[PDB]
């Protein structure tokens, strides 16, 4: 009777955890933010349009200097943009066209990419020979690679479609830690501002909080009805927002182990592809299959703006470190800077 | 360029040279014929690859026309999360094995194998990304089908079959059952080949079907139809 005994043990343990966290919800976040002054109506103009990709754009990432971009497209190209003068700094040709994610090193010396070849390729940008060369190829995932984030120049964490995440040592070239616990494909990563923890969002309608230096999950967050495609941290690292395929975004509290606010409307039927916050944490920007982005007042949960202008699905979206621009990429092969 | 420094002008012309290289590389890659090779477990696509981990790519050339063939069988993830990457291929090459009308599925002894392949065909044919990509259908192992049909009846797979228990009619029945899974009978088309052997029959059939697909695409995007 070990099987059903452990099954009912886990059932009652989850039930009492749920009851304990339900006896903690004093009042809804909408009840405490019921008197704050609303943001208003956020109106943005396309300052720059970045052209030169000849296929769908699947990923995009900002430099920490708040000026340079990296973008990955399915024409087998990884382009670095100036975004003040719309100049191309580098155009990197990939060995595999099926790139699904790209990342920019926080120092600026490296970019990484990955996709359907189950490999994370790390490129060296500042070489004395004057070209960009593949500095490392991390292999060991048995599924496609869905996200990758640099911790520093020598550490990267990667999500794959084999239901696991992995923290690597770029110098040695082999996994140092493996994070398991998801029952479906892992679709999104977000690093905490201090990179002591990260949050993962998977196809099992679940998110998890992993400690990097321990290799083991701290908390699990449920509440979505479909697959989670995007995830991002609140600017102080005490909350995070997910975007799933049921046309809802949600705000989860790390300390309370609960969700706070749902960002959904009756006129939206398509799933969210991207999620990002503003520098202060008041505006939540979400990219949609609707072909347009939406800006939500992240405290009262009412749409404070719309970013229309893309002819196809919005696949990627980001906000600069200084907080002065929003880059948006889409399946029509154009990026747009907004302000 | 007047309000630009010397170094800004040099950066601008470097960007322009990058643009030139990008256009040169992207016009060359628009002349490649991309084929998405699909199929079920032990369908027979290994022989098909022989005639002509992650994604497996196969470049070849036949009569001054370059073919890319992406075998995607090494991925056990959810197909709905990466299939849209293949929106825009010239055609989908689907391989079926005619010998599976009697074999039961490996994991499930109850569920049939031919019905599983038919389910996969109906899943990919009526998808929302492949509404207008033709499906070149190969029916492999036809020489192991006429041999196994002498002792085994096709009624095991299709209980509603009513006809002669010969190869020439049962093969037509199978082909019709696979072709009738199509819903958009006007938008897209299915090309069926009964493979098994010969010098250059399969490759030339793919060449014919691909040339026809290209002609129809040009007619559609160039006014007519």
């Amino acid at each position, epitope marked *: 009777s070990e099987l059903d005994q452990l099954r009912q043990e886990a059932e009652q343990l989850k039930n009492q955890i749920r009851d304990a966290r339900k006896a903690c919800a004093d009042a809804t976040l909408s009840q405490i933010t019921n008197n704050i002054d609303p943001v208003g109506r956020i109106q943005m103009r396309t300052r720059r349009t970045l052209r030169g990709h000849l296929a769908k754009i699947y990923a995009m990432h900002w430099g920490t200097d708040s*000026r340079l971009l990296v973008s990955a497209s399915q024409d087998g190209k990884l382009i670095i943009w100036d975004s003040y003068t719309t100049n191309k700094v580098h155009a990197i040709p990939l060995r595999s066209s099926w790139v699904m994610t790209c990342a920019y090193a926080p120092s600026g010396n490296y970019v990484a990419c990955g996709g359907l070849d189950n490999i994370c390729s790390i490129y060296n940008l500042k070489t004395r020979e004057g070209n960009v060369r593949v500095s490392r190829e991390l292999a060991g995932h048995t599924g496609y690679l869905s996200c990758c984030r640099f911790l520093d120049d020598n550490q990267i964490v990667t999500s794959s479609g084999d239901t696991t995440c992995a923290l690597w040592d770029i110098e040695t070239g082999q996994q140092t830690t493996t994070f398991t616990g998801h029952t479906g494909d892992v679709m999104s990563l977000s690093l905490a501002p201090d990179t002591r923890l990260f949050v993962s969002g998977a196809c099992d309608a679940s998110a998890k909080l992993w400690d990097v230096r321990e290799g083991m999950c701290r908390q699990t967050f449920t509440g979505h009805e479909s697959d989670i495609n995007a995830i991002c941290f609140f600017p102080n690292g005490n909350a995070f927002a997910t975007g799933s395929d049921d046309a809802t975004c949600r705000l989860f509290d790390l300390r309370a182990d609960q969700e706070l606010m749902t960002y959904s409307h009756d006129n939206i039927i398509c799933g969210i592809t991207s999620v990002s916050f503003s520098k202060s944490g008041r505006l939540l920007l979400a990219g949609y299959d609707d072909f347009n982005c939406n800006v939500w007042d992240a405290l009262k949960a009412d749409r404070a703006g719309v970013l229309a202008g893309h002819d196809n699905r919005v696949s990627c979206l980001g906000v600069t470190d200084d907080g002065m621009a929003v880059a948006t990429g889409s399946w029509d092969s154009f990026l747009k800077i907004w302000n | 360029g007047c*309000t630009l420094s010397a170094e800004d002008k040099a950066a601008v012309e*470097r960007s322009k040279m990058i643009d030139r290289n990008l256009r040169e590389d992207g016009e060359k890659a628009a002349r490649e014929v991309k084929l998405l090779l699909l199929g079920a477990g032990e369908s027979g696509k290994s022989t098909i690859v022989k005639q002509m981990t992650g994604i497996v790519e196969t470049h070849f050339t036949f009569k001054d026309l370059h073919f890319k063939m992406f075998d995607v069988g090494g991925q056990r993830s959810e197909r709905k999360k990466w299939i849209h990457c293949f929106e825009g291929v010239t055609a989908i090459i689907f391989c079926v094995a005619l010998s599976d009308y009697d074999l039961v599925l490996a994991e499930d002894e109850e569920m049939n194998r031919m019905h599983e392949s038919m389910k996969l065909f109906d899943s990919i044919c009526n998808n929302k990304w492949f509404t207008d990509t033709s499906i070149i259908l190969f029916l492999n192992k036809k020489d192991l089908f006429e041999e196994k049909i002498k002792k085994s009846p096709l009624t095991i797979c299709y209980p509603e079959y009513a006809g002669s228990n010969t190869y020439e009619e049962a093969a037509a029945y199978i082909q019709c059952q696979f072709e009738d899974l199509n819903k958009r009978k006007d938008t897209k088309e299915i090309y069926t080949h009964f493979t098994c052997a010969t010098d250059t029959k399969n490759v030339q059939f793919v060449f014919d079907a691909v040339t026809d697909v290209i002609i129809k695409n040009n007619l559609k995007d160039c006014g007519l139809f």
Partner: single-chain antibody
Amino acid sequence: VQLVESGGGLVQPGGSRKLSCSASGFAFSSFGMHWVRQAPEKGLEWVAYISSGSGTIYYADTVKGRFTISRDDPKNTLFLQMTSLRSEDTAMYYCVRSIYYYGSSPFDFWGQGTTLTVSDIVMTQATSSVPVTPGESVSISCRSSKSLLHSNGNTYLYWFLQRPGQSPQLLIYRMSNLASGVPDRFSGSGSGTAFTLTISRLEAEDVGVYYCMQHLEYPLTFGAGTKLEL
């Protein structure tokens, strides 16, 4: 990275000559090239420039009409065709690579040199010598005719160092950015029109001639040079 020049030697006056610089160890086709000469007992003097795709060529207006610059990219070679050589062209021609994108080092590697003997903004370095002792801070000053601080925030000042018998080396680019391979002892500063390079702890590998250059506009002009001897 290696650039080796050739084609020097004694030349009769009024004739012609051709210098070839062969590159090995870097992507030659993505680097602009400059020819920069130096009189036997004088400072550096920019001569010519050819861009990455050969689509932009400049000459100082003292060799214009007599000199031509070209690059063979498949063969990885740079040519200078000199015609009507006067007696004031006796120099040691160096070839220097230059890549311009956002954040690059445009004068990092200098060639080895070609000895040839024939039988705009003004950059001022007031002090022409510094009698200094090791272990103490050193300061050099450079003074520009006009402000180099462009409207985009970039001030285009370069600091090079030439040791006895060696090619010049990029110490600092854009007045504050320390070149890769340079110890943190060197430090550039200043603003707009007056600039200063400071060294904290002098060593025996720092004696030589220091040059300041502007890259605001062509022709690129070099400073007279301050000589640290110890």
